Amino acid sequence: RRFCHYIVTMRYFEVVILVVIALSSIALAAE
Numbered sequence: 001r002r003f004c005h006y007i008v009t010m011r012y013f014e015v016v017i018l019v020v021i022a023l024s025s026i027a028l029a030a031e
């Protein structure tokens, strides 16, 4: 499964992680 895990890190994964980081930061600021 590890090769699939490696390919997951390429499927525009960094942009999705960046977006979720930004949105969760905004959620932190919205409390």
Ligand SMILES: CC(C)CCC[C@@H](C)[C@H]1CC[C@H]2[C@@H]3CC=C4C[C@@H](OC(=O)CCC(=O)O)CC[C@]4(C)[C@H]3CC[C@]12C
Residues within 6 Å of the ligand: 025, 026, 029, 030
């Ligand atoms: C470049 C980076 C470092 C700056 C990114 C900006 C955001 C981190 C900040 C800027 C202004 C902030 C907003 C300022 C005030 C509010 C109102 C706040 O409360 C409400 O929705 C009011 C309604 C209610 O009181 O029921 C929700 C979060 C929000 C949009 C904040 C969310 C976080 C924001 C977008």
